A paper describes a structure:
Binding of the SARS-CoV-2 spike protein to its obligate angiotensin-converting enzyme 2 (ACE2) receptor on the target cell surface initiates infection. The receptor-binding-domain (RBD) for ACE2 is located in the S1 subunit, while the S2 subunit anchors the spike protein in the viral membrane. The RBD can adopt two distinct conformations: “down” and “up”; the “down” state is shielded from ACE2 binding, while the “up” state is ACE2-accessible. Immunization of this mouse line with SARS-CoV-2 (Wuhan-Hu-1) spike protein immunogens elicited several humanized VH1-2/Vκ1-33-based SARS-CoV-2-neutralizing antibodies that bound RBD in a different mode from each other and from those of many prior human patient-derived VH1-2-based neutralizing antibodies.
From the S trimer in the one-RBD-up conformation, we obtained maps for the Fab-RBD interfaces in the down conformation and in the up conformation at 3.3Å and 4.8Å resolution, respectively. Two glycans at Asn122 and Asn165 in the NTD were in proximity to CDR2 (Asn53, Ser54, Gly56, Thr57 and Asn58) and HC FW3 (Thr73, Ser74 and Ile75). We noted that these two glycosylation sites were highly conserved among different VOCs. Indeed, a surface plasmon resonance competition assay showed that SP-77 did not compete with ACE2 for binding to the RBD or spike trimer.
Residue numbers in the entry:
A (entry chain B): 341 to 583
B (entry chain L): 1 to 94, 96 to 213
C (entry chain H): 1 to 52, 52A, 53 to 82, 82A, 82B, 82C, 83 to 100, 100A, ...
D (entry chain C): 14 to 69, 77 to 244, 254 to 340
The structure:
């Protein structure tokens, strides 16, 4: 995800599915290579203490001046027609200056972005359309015309460009927390399960204190926790032996 | 295009010697260069990329340096697995390779053992004749073979095949084959080959006549 | 365990075409370019072109543009190179090579994983089995100290002939020299051995020659006149 | 291959009543012996659902709107409905989603598809071996940039059947929300001849595809010299989800066993406000009514000249 040779162009941002693995985030957060590391519903120090229902990495390249548009609730031509985060985003935005990887002395014109669109796109939607845009009130057809445009523009990345006009690689990690049966987890070791005694438990990052006992409740396969009228968890399915 | 040249077309080097091979681009290539090793009878292997980034798991002895038009690859002390052809490759505009530099192990001088082989009765029965001059276990590659019949120097009607360097003792061997019709073979009495080589005090002649 | 597996040796007439294939495994086949690189007998490498296996987009070196066609079947992770209207100096080893998944520059090509290479031979000559002739010094009485003797394998075309001595029982002091492509288009090679002059009375030497394209296995006993 | 099958008989669009169907588990949490109020995209109770069927003659697989979400139910025997197309233009100007249960595995794909103007699958029928073979798949002609693909681990379904009534009710809910296409489903065993079964059942979630595309329309895929054929007897029903509060009853086993559509009628709004499925005798105050805007107005002073910001 972080060291692949060729990142996607931002109009066609690649999404990778992360699953069935141990995610040590402490190496990512401690590495001073990342210029941005902003988390929107968790602390970057707590990511190891936790599990995630599904995890995705969205990877793309942009200009340093547009990195502010990758935050949730934003506006501007990247947030409008290339890559929109949801206003309730949970995850971490990670970005680093890729001028040693994505800039060429004549310009690395391989990194496109969408320059026109009829209206702004939905959160985590991907616009791949190559149809000719109409700016004027006239209709337009075929390959070109007056007040008509190809909807994609290319970024001129050269290692001569001024500070903020160099390329930056972005990974947005997005996930849903503590609600459901997880398959990505931080590097924590499990203990044995202690029943009938008052204990500080932690199931998949759901920390608490209580007496655990054998339940006659049957959960369906898609359920990991049970709740009370007060929203407190009052039952759980053990993640190693599915009791 | 970007034309690329490597300065040593081959370079003899001893075990433990430092090797330097230089690659020059016709245009300014900044640092957009890779280096690959090809050991005899295998596909190439990437060793350095981006002119000086050493690849994963390759020996620490290998180095690459320089930028612009002129670049270097280096082996800090040569080891007998390093023997092969080394190729540079630009990536600024369509990935062109250089001509390649052969390494070989340096050794002390050694003379060829010279043998000559007449055409067999089974071969003459086919209606064609060929006679072979064999040079075995010598080191300075450049051995030159002269073919004669009745003291007259022959040309174009003979060809020579040289081995790769012997891994056991770092030495070459070759043979030259001269070819004639069954009619052209019988009309000359004296058949000879002569070898001139750096490992000899003077040229040596091996010869025979038809019959014995 | 990343790998590229290619088709076996190809043999062709002038003006025909050849379809080399490259089955990938151990990585996501759409992730990176596959380059096609060739190498003529005893000469340097030559880049022909690439295919991007995700988009099917291709680019070629100018010499091959209008000759080479690159394609791919993503359902079987196989890239193909098709080369049309073949000439004699298209006789070469053809490699597919992958474009480095990690740590490179976003423009750069590289060639980090290479396939085994497919030999293509382009020539007029038909398949023919070797004629194998004994080589011995002069006469038995003109031998001295360490002798050398051999067998010459003559006029055979489907490249790869294998020579071995006494069914592989003898290997100390053996040579089998690289083949020479003759003016008739047929190959020849010489294979030779060194032995003490004393052992010729105790034992005899047989070169065994196997030529798979002609199914021609032939053994020559070598004797001093 | 692609073909426009023409021997169809013209019927007007049929309709039926969605009594108390297309409710689903609203989140992935266990609850039991509780009445839970949830606001989400649900099929409204007793809503008017459009009815489609294949028989003898009939084969109605049209393109339909897909707006806020879809409830889809196929009443069935012999596995005739097998999938859907979703997208905005269905013709390689844009991406589109294919979900299709061919006879051996489900394939899910997101590509710039050129779909046929009449997409179908086909079964070669009873032919001499006394067995039925899938041999036709006339869904698309090109599929360029596939940014998502999934293919299921293989099985082998039964392609034959003849019975006087349907045996399987198979229900789905589709939502396309912030890049994720969410599928909920249920299977129920039945015995009926020609309607959407009256009753109650709640759909479990089964997948959550990260497809990232605009969906505005959809079309179902059905199983059948390229014209003249028999369509197998089957029916399907379509209704649109709407943003609505429901009060769900979970039983002691923690399964949704009943629900109240909180805006169906004035009694349902009292059940939903009292948080009880029974109401005692009385007069109850409920959500205040209020007439909403007929149209917008703007009134600004009429000024033509722009401000001199350049100066
Ligand atoms: C239903 O649609 C499926 C998707 O097009 C199609 O799947 C393809 O089926 C074949 C035969 O089972 C598979 O063939 C390969 O199977 C394994 C792969 O590891 C190999 O051992 C085999 O040698 C062979 O290469 C294909 O892999 C599979 N396609 C994909 C993309 O995986 C089904 O065949 C369709 N069903 C019917 C009834 O047509
Ligand atoms: C979706 O699939 C499309 C078809 O495979 C693909 O089209 C490809 O677009 C690029 C960019 O224009 C083309 O590149 C060539 O475009 C013209 C050709 O005349 C030249 O000006 C350029 O220099 C360049 O040679 C590809 O040729 C074209 N592919 C095909 C087969 O036509 C889309 O780009 C795909 N969408 C993606 C990757 O998001
Ligand atoms: C300030 O000036 C910029 C551009 O400078 C001028 O551009 C020409 C119009 C001409 O007057 C030149 O001599 C000047 O150098 C204006 O930027 C333009 O803004 C319009 C939208 O109003 C946009 O369509 C153009 O593409 C922009 N072009 C450039 C080069 O910036 C800007 O509008 C001026 N600001 C004010 C308040 O007038
Ligand atoms: C999803 O697709 C629809 C259909 O193409 C888009 O709706 C059109 O949007 C433009 C915006 O200028 C309007 O001019 C059209 O009148 C709309 N068409 C219809 C049928 O209403 C819609 O915008 C797309 N979604 C997004 C987020 O762009
Ligand atoms: C199937 O039928 C439809 C309509 O009967 C065909 O759609 C026509 O396509 C042509 C171009 O091929 C257009 O000029 C027409 O305007 C289209 N008609 C309509 C009503 O949209 C379609 O091409 C046919 N396809 C096949 C494979 O038969
Ligand atoms: C909850 O589920 C259990 C099964 O897990 C149901 O128990 C069965 O109920 C019937 C009718 O009372 C008995 O004949 C069976 O012997 C019971 N089986 C077991 C294993 O106990 C129970 O009825 C369900 N409760 C509700 C309200 O549906
Ligand atoms: C985890 O491993 C234990 C034994 O080490 C096993 O009982 C259990 O089934 C495993 N977990 C799951 C989810 O299968
Ligand atoms: C469903 O809607 C149609 C009009 O779109 C109407 O003709 C039909 O009678 C309605 N059915 C019911 C059950 O109200
Ligand atoms: C009959 O079945 C066999 C395999 O079961 C198949 O190869 C053949 O095509 C079938 N013939 C017909 C007419 O369906």
């Amino acid at each position: 995800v972080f060291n692949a040779t060729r990142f996607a162009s931002v109009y066609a941002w690649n999404r990778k599915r992360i699953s069935n693995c141990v995610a040590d985030y402490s190496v990512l957060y401690n590495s001073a290579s990342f210029s941005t590391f902003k988390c929107y519903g968790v602390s970057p120090t707590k990511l190891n203490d936790l599990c995630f229902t599904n995890v995705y990495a969205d990877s793309f390249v942009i200009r340093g001046d547009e990195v502010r548009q990758i935050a949730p609730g934003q506006t501007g031509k990247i947030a409008d027609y290339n890559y929109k985060l949801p206003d309730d985003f949970t995850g971490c935005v990670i970005a680093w200056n890729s001028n040693n990887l994505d800039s060429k002395v004549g310009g690395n014109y391989n990194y496109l972005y969408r320059l026109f669109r009829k209206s702004n796109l939905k959160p985590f939607e991907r616009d791949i359309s190559t149809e000719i845009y109409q700016a004027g009130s006239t209709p337009c057809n075929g390959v070109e015309g007056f007040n008509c445009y190809f909807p994609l523009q290319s970024y001129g990345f050269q290692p001569t460009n001024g500070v903020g006009y160099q390329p930056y690689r972005v990974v947005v990690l997005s996930f849903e927390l503590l609600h459901a049966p997880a398959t990505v987890c931080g590097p924590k070791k499990s203990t044995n399960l202690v029943k009938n005694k008052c204990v500080n438990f932690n199931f998949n990052g759901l920390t608490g204190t209580g007496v655990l006992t054998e339940s006659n409740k049957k959960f369906l396969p898609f359920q990991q926790f049970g709740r009370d009228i007060a929203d407190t968890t009052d039952a759980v399915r053990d993640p190693q032996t599915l009791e | 295009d970007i034309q690329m040249t490597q300065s040593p077309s081959s370079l003899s080097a001893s075990v433990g010697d430092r090797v330097t091979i230089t690659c020059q681009a016709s245009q300014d290539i900044s640092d957009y260069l890779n280096w690959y090793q090809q050991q005899p009878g295998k596909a190439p292997k990437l060793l350095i990329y981006d002119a000086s980034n050493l690849e994963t798991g390759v020996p620490s002895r290998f180095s690459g340096s320089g930028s612009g038009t002129d670049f270097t690859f280096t082996i800090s002390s040569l080891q007998p697995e390093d023997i092969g052809t080394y190729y540079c490759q630009q990536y600024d505009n369509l990935p062109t390779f250089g001509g390649g530099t052969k390494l070989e192990i340096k050794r002390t001088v050694a003379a060829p053992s010279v043998f000559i082989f007449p055409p067999s009765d089974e071969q003459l029965k086919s209606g064609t004749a060929s006679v072979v001059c064999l040079l075995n276990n010598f080191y300075p590659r450049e051995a030159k073979v002269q073919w004669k019949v009745d003291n007259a120097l022959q040309s174009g009607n003979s060809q020579e095949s040289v081995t790769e360097q012997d891994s056991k003792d770092s030495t070459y061997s070759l043979s030259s084959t001269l070819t004639l019709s069954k009619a052209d073979y019988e009309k000359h009495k004296v058949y000879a080959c002569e070898v001139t080589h750096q490992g000899l005090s003077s040229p040596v002649t091996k010869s025979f006549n038809r019959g014995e | 365990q990343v790998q590229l597996v290619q088709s076996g040796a190809e043999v062709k007439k002038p003006g025909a075409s050849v379809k080399v294939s490259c089955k990938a495994s151990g990585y996501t086949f759409t992730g990176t370019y596959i380059h096609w690189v060739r190498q003529a007998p005893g000469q340097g490498l030559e880049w022909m072109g690439w295919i991007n296996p995700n988009s099917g987009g291709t680019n070629f070196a100018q010499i091959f543009q209008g000759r080479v066609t690159l394609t791919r079947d993503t359902s079987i992770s196989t890239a193909y190179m098709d080369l049309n209207r073949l000439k004699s100096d298209d006789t070469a080893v053809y490699y597919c090579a992958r474009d480095r998944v990690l740590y490179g520059r976003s423009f750069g090509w590289y060639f980090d994983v290479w396939g085994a290479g497919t030999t293509v031979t382009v020539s007029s000559a038909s398949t023919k089995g070797p004629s194998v002739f004994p080589l011995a010094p002069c006469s038995r009485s003109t031998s001295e100290s360490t002798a050398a003797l051999g067998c010459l394998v003559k006029d055979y075309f489907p490249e790869p002939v294998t020579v071995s001595w006494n069914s592989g029982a003898l290997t100390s002091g053996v040579h089998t020299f690289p083949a020479v492509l003759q003016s008739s288009g047929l190959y020849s090679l010489s294979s030779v051995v060194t032995v003490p002059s004393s052992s010729l009375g105790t034992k005899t030497y047989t070169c065994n020659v196997d030529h798979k394209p002609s199914n021609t296995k032939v053994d020559k006993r070598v004797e001093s006149k | 291959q692609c073909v426009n099958l023409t021997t169809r008989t013209q019927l007007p669009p049929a309709y039926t009543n969605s009594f108390t169907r297309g409710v689903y588990y609203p989140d992935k949490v266990f609850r039991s012996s509780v009445l839970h109020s949830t606001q989400d995209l649900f099929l409204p109770f007793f809503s008017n659902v459009t009815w489609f069927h294949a028989i003898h003659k009939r084969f109605d697989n049209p393109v339909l709107p897909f707006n806020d979400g879809v409830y889809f139910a196929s009443t069935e025997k012999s596995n005739i409905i097998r999938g859907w197309i979703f997208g905005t233009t269905l013709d390689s100007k844009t991406q589109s989603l294919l979900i299709v249960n061919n006879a051996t595995n489900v394939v899910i794909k997101v590509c710039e598809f050129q779909f046929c103007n009449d997409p179908f699958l086909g079964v070669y029928y009873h032919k001499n071996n006394k067995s039925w073979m899938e041999s036709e798949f006339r869904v698309y002609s090109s599929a360029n940039n596939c940014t998502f693909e999934y293919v299921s681990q293989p099985f082998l379904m039964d392609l034959e059947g003849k019975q006087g009534n349907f045996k399987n009710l198979r229900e789905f809910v589709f939502k396309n929300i912030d890049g994720y296409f969410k599928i909920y489903s249920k299977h129920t065993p039945i015995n009926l001849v020609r309607d959407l079964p009256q009753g109650f059942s709640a759909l479990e979630p089964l997948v959550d595809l990260p497809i990232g595309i605009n969906i505005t329309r959809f079309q179902t895929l059905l199983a059948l010299s390229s014209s003249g054929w028999t369509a197998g007897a089957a029916a399907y029903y379509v209704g649109y989800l709407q943003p609505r509060t429901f009060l769900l009853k979970y039983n002691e086993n923690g399964t949704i066993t009943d629900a109240v559509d909180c805006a169906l009628d004035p009694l349902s709004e009292t059940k939903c406000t009292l948080k009880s499925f029974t109401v005692e005798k009385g007069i109850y105050q409920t959500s205040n009514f209020r007439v909403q805007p007929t149209e917008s107005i703007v009134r600004f002073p009429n000024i033509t000249n722009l401000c001199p910001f350049g100066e």
